[PDB]
Amino acid sequence: YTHVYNYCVGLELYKRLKEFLKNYLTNLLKDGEDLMDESVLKFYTQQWEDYRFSSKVLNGICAYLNRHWVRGIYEIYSLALVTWRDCLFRPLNKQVTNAVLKLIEKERNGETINTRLISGVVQSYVELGLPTLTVYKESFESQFLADTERFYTRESTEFLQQNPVTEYMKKAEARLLEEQRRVQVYLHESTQDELAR
Amino acid sequence: ASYHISNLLEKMTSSDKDFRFMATNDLMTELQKDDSERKVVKMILKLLEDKNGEVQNLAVKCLGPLVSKVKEYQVETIVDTLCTNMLSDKEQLRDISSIGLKTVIGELPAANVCKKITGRLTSAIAKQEDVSVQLEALDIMADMLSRQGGLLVNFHPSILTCLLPQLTSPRLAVRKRTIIALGHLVMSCFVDLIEHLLSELSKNDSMSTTRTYIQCIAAISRQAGHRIGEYLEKIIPLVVKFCNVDDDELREYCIQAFESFVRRCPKEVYPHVSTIINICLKYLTDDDMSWKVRRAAAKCLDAVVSTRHEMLPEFYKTVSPALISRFKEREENVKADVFHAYLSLLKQTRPVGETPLTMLQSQVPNIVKALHKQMKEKSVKTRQCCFNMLTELVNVLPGALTQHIPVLVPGIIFSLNDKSSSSNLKIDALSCLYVILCNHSPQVFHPHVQALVPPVVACVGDPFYKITSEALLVTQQLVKVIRPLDQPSSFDATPYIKDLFTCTIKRLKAADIDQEVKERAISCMGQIICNLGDNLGSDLPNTLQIFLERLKNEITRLTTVKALTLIAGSPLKIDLRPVLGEGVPILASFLRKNQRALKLGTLSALDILIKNYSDSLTAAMIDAVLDELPPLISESDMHVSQMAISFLTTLAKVYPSSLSKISGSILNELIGLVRSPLLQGGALSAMLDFFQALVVTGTNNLGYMDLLRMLTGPVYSTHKQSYYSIAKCVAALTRACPKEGPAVVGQFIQDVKNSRSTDSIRLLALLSLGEVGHHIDLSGQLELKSVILEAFSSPSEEVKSAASYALGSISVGNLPEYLPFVLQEITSQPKRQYLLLHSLKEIISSASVVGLKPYVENIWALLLKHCECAEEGTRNVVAECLGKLTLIDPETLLPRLKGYLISGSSYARSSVVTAVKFTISDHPQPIDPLLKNCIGDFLKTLEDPDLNVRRVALVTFNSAAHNKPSLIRDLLDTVLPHLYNETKVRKELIREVEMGPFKHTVDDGLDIRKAAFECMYTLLDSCLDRLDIFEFLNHVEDGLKDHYDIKMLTFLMLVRLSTLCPSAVLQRLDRLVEPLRATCTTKVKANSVKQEFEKQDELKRSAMRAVAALLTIPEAEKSPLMSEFQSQISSNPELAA
Amino acid sequence: PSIKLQSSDGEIFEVDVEIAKQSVTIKTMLEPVPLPNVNAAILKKVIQWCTHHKDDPPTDDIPVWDQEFLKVDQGTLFELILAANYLDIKGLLDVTCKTVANMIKGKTPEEIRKTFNIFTEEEEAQVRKENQWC
């Protein structure tokens, strides 16, 4: 904290911090290829938690000589968020989405497992943006709703083909209750209306 | 307007009737769409005393909506004047005042009027010479209590103690009005008032009793019976000791019982009252009353049967069903009510220490002879009750009355042939006959056809349409039963052929007949033809035009198509070739409108017709059918396309000379539908069969090579499902040609080459190779494993799954030549283990039991080696493989697996637990009986050896409960203490991260707590009436201040408990409210980063929603630390709504 | 509750949550640490001002007490303003800024420069020419 203001010369610090954050993030992402499912989720969640904790510490330890004088966003938290947002465009997003979807289908098959693994990335996407959700709905939420709709159409088709409508009503109500539970205690609260509709 | 109202007042105030009428119409129209209000109020008061009826009606109707815009100063004045006139002498003025008061209170939603009127009536209700005043006051008070009943902070005791002496009035009417008023009061009701009321009633009970006290108790209990639980234990003994009286007074005593059961379900006093009513049913001595006392006992039996569900053996093992059955020869009301009780009991017998089936079967003969004895009555109601009883007894279980058909047939015959029979009686008799014929086997209906054919045939032709439709259903069922093609039968039904045909063809004509009867006749004709038409040869080639002409009609289009489908799919040959030429275009012309059911029906009809009959087929009908395919094929609908492709699937195998014209549009639509994301299951199999038929048809421009080229064209120039579908299609195409050499080497060289070879092309080729290597042998060719390994060694992650699937499929293609190699690779290759493990999993899943039984031992010997691995995913894969392998030969693979629960280490125990957790599946499995007993040891061995092992055990329990809650129902009582042991806060590895201003606790047993809460939730939503409730409530109310996610889960569970059986939630309201109030007035530390604040709306918003859901319950008088509308929480209410 | 802090010279002072609520840089601390920038003299000066000025609604339009409270030498005012900037305080920062602004109101350039202890004969004539409009 003393070195924060003792630095002021006193202006060429933002570029160095951005370069350090970028290189550290690239190094962290480099060791994220050998894991695709049931292992990349835990690792990604814990690395994201560590990154968020480090960003919070950095924001709380130096928040004076960033944009106080006159005026990526200068804010440390916003800078970390924008770096995470523009780094997430790498092909690892597709594999993370595939892992999350396959975990969701496995959970919906009848078994249950821990929830924080994909809850971490859900809160990451909800917090990312600056809630200003721009990339979230644009790409990942939209594709997730697409897969959800496709999967529910498949379920309806096979259930109608095989089982009678009497059990179909109960299955649909159970699925809707599960979606209500998910949108309440598993995902964000700013999507109940559109999801329902 | 001022001038307008002045002119209206001047013109109206002229002592005129018509002018007053028009002015009243005008002011009501104005109201609908300082001094003036005084003037109009005074003039309305003057008109209130006018002798005219129409003017008084107009004024009193205007008084209603006038309260909305009138001032609030003179409302008390007009109310007081009306109350003063209420005490007048002329009865007409009394009626006018009562009408006015009722009107104003009806239009009322300023509030001083209610207080004034109740205060005045408190003195008015007191004893007076006139009895009409008392009746009017009681009616008014009833109206108040029905409509009002809000605050009443200090008015309920006064009205209470003033109305108490009125209960002993000699007039029965006054007593009834007082009872109604008291019931309305308790319904609207406070914390102690019912206590003094019940104490006074109990004190008065120990005196010269009268029907008034019992009637009042019954009324107040019916209006509000959810607040009398501690007073009953002295209420029932009083009823029992007052029942043994000679004079007829037991009516209200028995009426009390059924409402007591209806209101309060949980109470351990049932046997005494049940025995009391069982004894009271025996009284048998309008002057005579004894024919009516049993009505109350019957209602009591109805209520006790309806409310009780969990003590069926107690009811059945007693003499209660016996006494109910024998007590049948009584009056019409008694017979009807006992029949209703028995029907309700039988409806309850359906599931929601011998099983109820044994006692039901033993009592079946008794019910049968009782019903047969009851048949000998001329009353229609008894016949309908008996037929409903028979229908219920047959519907509850199949094959019930398999030894009483010969003695029950004559009763049905008499009830169908008698001239004195209602339409409902015939309808229910026919329905009972049809359901008996359907459920029971055909073997107990062959001798009775001679007796069942004449009456059914006679009943087919009736003026009514419901009776005719039911008769047609019975005829169709009898036709199906008499000639069962499933099992050979020895009986001659030649005489019945013409007898059934005459009626069936007679009802098939229009004859201005309703749609339902026509459809039933069409169905009967279709079934008769399908199962019996070889006897009908003269009318077969001429009566088929009726179906053709009826196909155009929209009213009857589905039924005729279904009948045609049933006829075509008959094992016995039916001649339809002359009709096929004129029938196919008719069905084809209907493939334009949007109707899924009709589309599927006509597709099925055409498919079965072309399958069974294909000797004569022209080209016009084929072209018409093909041209109607593009409108049927669509992405949104799958079943219609799945059924339409069957046309070409059958054509390519039966008539191979009609495939050259399938190109351009149909081919493009089929290609587009193949790559559609929604094509799974039977659609894929139909695709494979059709493509194989196309390959084997041997026609120009439809070979394997050109099809392969046209399919691979777009690939060289999408989602994963398109690749999977196209790979399956090409695999099916090349499957029909096992001697396919050039294509295999071409695919190999396509994969081996690097230049001009994308990842998608090689992935598709490898997947196709795997799919084709399922059954055909391809190991003869050399230089195959090297290229496979070279192609598999790619950096793309998406190709890994396809490579593993292809390797597994190649391995299962011929196990003996590939199993040793893959085993050696698993034992040798340390790096590429994920791919090998996935391939082994695929092999085990797809391996046949014949080809895997000798290979079980070495697979087990290798699987246990990889139990301990650094990577979690590898261990999970081995656990899944062990679980899948356990599915075959349980009696050998399960006993060994049970052995490492005590010999193996903690890691081995966790491995076997994670393996056995995957054995349980939603669908029934043959290993279920063994697991049902093995789970006991599996869960008793794992008590608390380690945190990791405990977490895996908890996950196993949650998965087992979710998959099959009924599997673990018995052992749940054993593990409930163990489940609740790890629910409290324990300090185990929580490291206090002391950095400075910011903190972040690391609780490793958050995962265990979340798992336990998940098992609690799934137990609650699966079966909640199987565990202690107080302990669960204490646990859920204690575990709040640990973490955010657990806090939301607890809030959601509390919301669920609010909307599901909230009886146990209304006790500890303060204990639940206190933590929420404590955490709401929590302000998160300011200067924290914005996500926390956003979470806090979710915590504050979630708390608001939970509080609203909790207060949705009827009990809302208590408001502990709730009335605080602070600025921060001011807008939260409306945000929740 | 009682919270203690470590002074630069090595003294220990007692602080309260209410007395430190108006601060933001030590509020995060209360929600001993080395603080070399501040010293004992400013610590007692700040803590006594906070005690006497803690409850308030959320001449020279300033409290009359502040007139005699800030009557110190220039060196101490330099230390006070440096601490106020470091402690990101608002009430004390605004008061001293207003006091400085009043003391620089209507003063000759020679005395202002000498007191401050900190562009003449080449641009003084120019700036004078385009500033007579006032």
Instruction: Determine the Cα–Cα distance for residues B1031 and B1029; give it in Å rounded to an integer.
Output: 6
Cβ atoms of residues C17 and C29 within 8 Å: no
Q: Decide if B488 touches C, using CB distance below 8 A.
A: no
Task: Write the secondary structure of A108-146 as one string of H (helix), E (strand) and C (coil).
Answer: HCCCCCCCHHHHHHHHHHHHCCCCCCCHHHHHHHHHHHH
Strands (DSSP E) found in B582-623: none
Nearest residue on chain C to A1, alpha-carbon basis: C35
Angle, helices B332-348/B290-307, rounded to nearest 10 degrees:
10
Torsions phi, psi for A155 (to 5 deg): -60, -45
Distance CA B712, CA B708 (A): 6
* A111–B contact, CB cutoff 8 A: yes
> Which residues in chain C have Cβ-Cβ distances shorter than 8 Å to A3?
none
Query: Measured between CA atoms, how close is A74 to chain B, in angstroms?
Result: 15
C34: closest CA of chain A, how far (Å) = 10
* Distance between first and last Cα of chain A: 51
In 10 A of CB B674, how many CB atoms? 18
The whole-angstrom distance between C26's CA and the closest CA on chain A is 13
How crowded is residue B379: how many other Cβ atoms within 10 Å of its Cβ?
A: 10
As a whole number of angstroms, the distance between CA B534 and CA B574 comes to 7
Residue A58 to residue B194: CA distance in whole angstroms: 65
If phi > 0 it is left, if psi is from -120 to 50 it is alpha, else beta; for residue B996 that is left
Q: How many residue pairs from chains A and B have C-beta atoms closer than 8 A? A: 77
Sign of CA dihedral B204, B210, B216, B217: positive
Which residue blocks in A2-115 are alpha helix, DSSP H?
A: 2-6, 14-30, 40-61, 76-87, 92-108
- Tokens (6 digits) for B48: 């209130």
**Structure tokens given for B348:** 């309850």
Cα A174 from Cα B958, distance rounded (Å): 17
Long-range contacts of B1016-1020 (CB under 8 A, 24+ apart): B1016/B979, B1016/B1053, B1017/B1049, B1017/B1053, B1018/A112, B1018/B958, B1018/B961, B1018/B962, B1018/B965, B1019/B961, B1019/B965, B1019/B972, B1020/B1053, B1020/B1056, B1020/B1057
The pair of three-digit structure tokens given for residue A171, joined into one six-digit string: 């299955």
Report the DSSP beta bridge partners of residue B1002.
B991
Beta carbons of A119 and B1045 less than 8 Å apart: yes
The verdict on a CB contact (< 8 Å) between A5 and C86 is yes
Residue in the structure block whose two tokens are 């202690």 = B1028
DSSP state of B871: S
Q: Where are the domains of chain C?
A: 1-134
* C75 CB-near residues (< 8 Å, 6+ apart): none
How many residues would you count in chain B? Answer: 1137
A112 vs A103: CA distance, rounded Å:
10
Q: Are strands C2-6 and C12-16 parallel, antiparallel or unpaired?
A: antiparallel
Distance CA B325, CA B613 (A): 58
The string of DSSP letters for B909-956 reads HHHHHHHHTTT--SS--TTHHHHHHHHHHHHHH-SSS-HHHHHHHHHH
- Residue B645 near residue B689, CB atoms below 8 Å: no
Contact A2 C88 (CB under 8 A): no
CB contact under 8 A, C88 and A64: yes
- Residues whose CB is less than 8 angstroms from the CB of residue C101 and which lie 6 or more positions away in sequence, other chains included: none
What tokens does B986 get? 């324990």
Q: Give the chain B residue whose CA is nearest to the CA of A33.
A: B797
Helix (H, G, I), strand (E, B) or coil at B192: coil
Position of tokens 């070739």?
B577
Q: Which chain A residue has the Cα nearest residue C24?
A: A60
Residue B287 Cα distances to B333, B889, B1019, angstroms: 17, 78, 59
Neighboring chain B residues of A113 at a CB cutoff of 8 Å:
955
DSSP state string for B314-361: HHHHSSHHHHHHHTTSS-HHHHHHHHHHHHHHHHHTS-----HHHHHH
- Min Cα–Cα distance to chain A from C56, Å: 27
**Angstrom distance (rounded) from CA A130 to CA A81:** 7
Instruction: Count CA within 13 A, CB hemisphere, residue B396.
Output: 22
CB contact under 8 A, A115 and B638: no
**A179/B contact by beta carbon, under 8 A:** no
State which residue of chain C sits closest to B1085, comparing Cα positions. Answer: C31
Give which of B1083, B1087, B1092 to mutate to test C binding, by max C Cβ within 10 Å. B1087
Whether C88 and A60 lie within 8 Å, measured CB to CB: no
Q: Which residue has the tokens 């646990």?
A: B1035
Round to whole Å and give the CA distance between B230 and B209. Answer: 22
Instruction: Please tell me if residue A33 touches chain B, with a CB cutoff of 8 Å.
Output: yes
Mutation target vs A (from C86, C89, C93; most A CBs, 10 A cutoff): C86
- CB distance from C34 to chain B under 8 Å? no
Quickly tell me which residue has 């080729």 as its tokens: B765
B1011 and A37: CB-CB below 8 Å?
Answer: no
Number of CB atoms found within 10 A of residue B63's CB: 21
Q: Which two tokens stand for residue A123?
A: 């809160």
CA distance B302 to C63: 85
* DSSP structural state of residue B887: T
Largest CA distance in chain A: 76
Do the chains contact at B1087 and C29, CB–CB below 8 Å?
no
**Opening angle at CA B488, ends B485 and B489, nearest 5:** 105
- Contacts for B881 with CB less than 8 Å, ≥ 6 apart: B837, B840, B841, B844, B863, B915
Q: Which residue of A has its CA nearest to B721?
A: A150
C78-114 burial, b at 16+ Cβ within 10 Å, e below that, comes to ebbeebbebbebeebbebbeebeeeeeeeeeeeeeee
**Contact of B272 with B233, CB cutoff 8 Å:** no
Q: Name the 3-class secondary structure at C16.
A: strand
- Determine the residue among C24, C26, C37 to mutate to test chain A binding: the one whose Cβ has the most chain A Cβ atoms within 10 Å: C37
Q: Strand, helix or coil at B832?
A: coil
Cα radius of gyration rounded to whole Å, chain B: 41
The token pair at B326 is 């024998």
What does this entry list as its resolution, in Å? 3.1
Is C37 close to A60, i.e. CB distance below 8 A? no
Q: How far apart are CA B839 and CA B825, in angstroms?
A: 12
Chain C interface includes A7 (CB < 8 A) = no
Residue B410, token pair as written in the block: 């004559």
Please list every residue in chain C whose beta carbon sits closer than 8 Å to the beta carbon of residue A60.
28
Chain A residues closer than 8 Å to C28 by CB: 60
Query: Are residues C24 and B997, on separate chains, in Cβ contact within 8 Å?
Result: no
The string over B585-615, giving b where at least 16 C-beta atoms fall within 10 Å of a residue's C-beta and e elsewhere, is eebbebbeeebeebbbbbbbbbbbbbbebee
Beta bridge partners of C5: C13
Q: How far apart are CA B839 and CA B1012, in angstroms?
A: 34
Tell me the Ramachandran region of residue C117: left when phi exceeds 0, alpha when psi lies from -120 to 50, beta otherwise.
Answer: left
Contact B1087 C28 (CB under 8 A): yes
Nearest chain B residue to A75, by CA: B1089
Give the H/E segment covering residue C6. Answer: strand C2-6
> Nearest chain C Cα to A5, which residue?
C86
Chain A contact set for B1091 (CB, 8 A): 123, 127
Q: Which residues of A touch C93 (CB under 8 A)?
A: none
Q: How many CB atoms lie within 10 A of CB B869?
A: 17
Two tokens, residue B286: 């309008």
Structural determination approach: cryo-EM
Return the partners of chain C (3 or more C-beta pairs < 8 Å): A, B
| DSSP secondary structure of B1044-1081 | HHHHHHHHHHHHHHHHS-GGGTSSSHHHHHHHHHHHHT
Q: What is the 3-state secondary structure (H, E, C) of B271-312?
A: HHHHHHHHHHCCCCCCCCCHHHHHHHHHHHHHHHHHHCCCCH
A184/B contact by beta carbon, under 8 A: yes
Which chain A residues are Cβ-neighbours of C88 within 8 angstroms? 64
Taking the Cβ of residue B593 and every Cβ of chain C, the question of whether any pair is shorter than 8 Å is answered with: no
Instruction: Show Cβ contacts of residue B278 under 8 Å, excluding neighbours closer than 6 positions.
Output: B319, B320, B323
**Residues of chain C with C-beta less than 8 angstroms from the C-beta of B997:** 28-29, 31
- CA separation for the pair B557, B1126 (Å, rounded): 67
Q: Which chain B residues touch A147 with a CB distance below 8 Å?
A: none
For residue B892, give every residue at least 6 positions away whose Cβ sits within 8 Å of its Cβ, in sequence order, or none.
B856
Task: Collect all residues of chain C within an 8 Å Cβ-Cβ radius of residue B1085.
Answer: 31
Distance CA B173, CA B135 (A): 8
Do residues B1065 and B1072 lie in contact, with contact meaning Cβ atoms separated by under 8 Å? yes
Kindly determine whether residue C29 and residue B996, on different chains, have CB atoms separated by under 8 Å: yes
Q: Does A72 touch chain B (CB under 8 A)?
A: no
Q: DSSP assignment of B389-430, as one string? A: HHHHHHHHSTT-SSS-HHHHHHHHHHHHH-SS--HHHHHHHH
Is the distance from CB of B855 to CB of B819 less than 8 angstroms?
A: yes
| b/e A39-59 (16+ beta carbons within 10 angstroms → b) | bbbeebbebbeebbeebbbbb
**Which residues of chain B lie closer than 8 angstroms to A90, CB-CB?**
none
Mind telling me how many Å the CA of C117 is from chain B's nearest CA?
38
The answer to whether A60 contacts C36, with C-beta atoms less than 8 Å apart, is: no
Q: Per the CB < 8 Å rule, is A189 touching B1052? A: no
Measured CA to CA in angstroms, residue A99 lies from A109, A153, B293, B677, C61 at distances of 15, 21, 71, 19, 65
Q: C29: nearest CA in chain A?
A: A60
- Chains with 3 or more CB pairs under 8 A to chain A: B, C
**Are B997 and C28 a contacting pair at CB < 8 A?**
yes
C115 contacts chain A (CB < 8 A): no
DSSP bridge pairs for C12: C6
A-facing residues of B in 1028-1067 (CB < 8 A) are 1045, 1048-1049, 1052
Q: What string of H, E and C letters represents the secondary structure of B208-226?
A: CCCHHHHHHHHHHHHHCCC
Smallest CA-to-CA distance from B880 within B844, B832, B827 is with B844
| Cα separations in angstroms, B414 against B382, B469, B777 | 14, 20, 72
Comparing C-alpha atoms, which of B23, C29, B634 is closest to residue A60? C29
**CB neighbour class for B554 (10 Å; exposed up to 12, middle 13-18, buried from 19):** exposed
Structure tokens at B939: 């869960």
* Residue with tokens 């690792």, as numbered in its chain: A43
